[PDB]
Amino acid sequence: LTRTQRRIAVVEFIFSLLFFLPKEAEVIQADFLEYDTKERQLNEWQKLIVKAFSENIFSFQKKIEEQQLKNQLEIQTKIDLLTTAVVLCALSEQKAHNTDKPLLISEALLIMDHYSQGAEKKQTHALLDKLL
Ligand SMILES: [Cl-]
Ligand SMILES: [Cl-]
Ligand code: NA
Ligand code: NA
Ligand code: NA
């Protein structure tokens, strides 16, 4: 599997959880194990993202909540749950693996295309991730 496919697997997982939150951190981590299949071949790289997600979901969800709002501009001189799941994965991944900002954003937009969301305009906030 490609790193992109592995990212998609985390996104879909997170997505399925956002309908029924909150769950305890170790519960989500154990739910991720039951989520594994022949095709997913879930590895430690993905499990570390889900671990960061499980332990920081309250803060990530807050940071998101407030960045959207803080986007209230004049000049320059309703986020959905799939788009949220994509953004939380990027936050989770930068936390677990310290992936650089440019790679995370391109990848995120690539996943949005995969789900034919075409709401790419809500970048992975150039505001929410750190450029190293
Ligand atoms: Cl895939
Ligand atoms: Cl999948
Ligand atoms: Na790989
Ligand atoms: Na995990
Ligand atoms: Na953590």
UniProtKB/Swiss-Prot annotation:
Pfam families (UniProt xref): DUF1948 (PF09185)
**S-S pairs:** none
Q: Which SUPFAM superfamilies match?
A: NusB-like
Name its species: Mycoplasma genitalium (strain ATCC 33530 / DSM 19775 / NCTC 10195 / G37)
UniProt name for this protein: Uncharacterized protein MG027
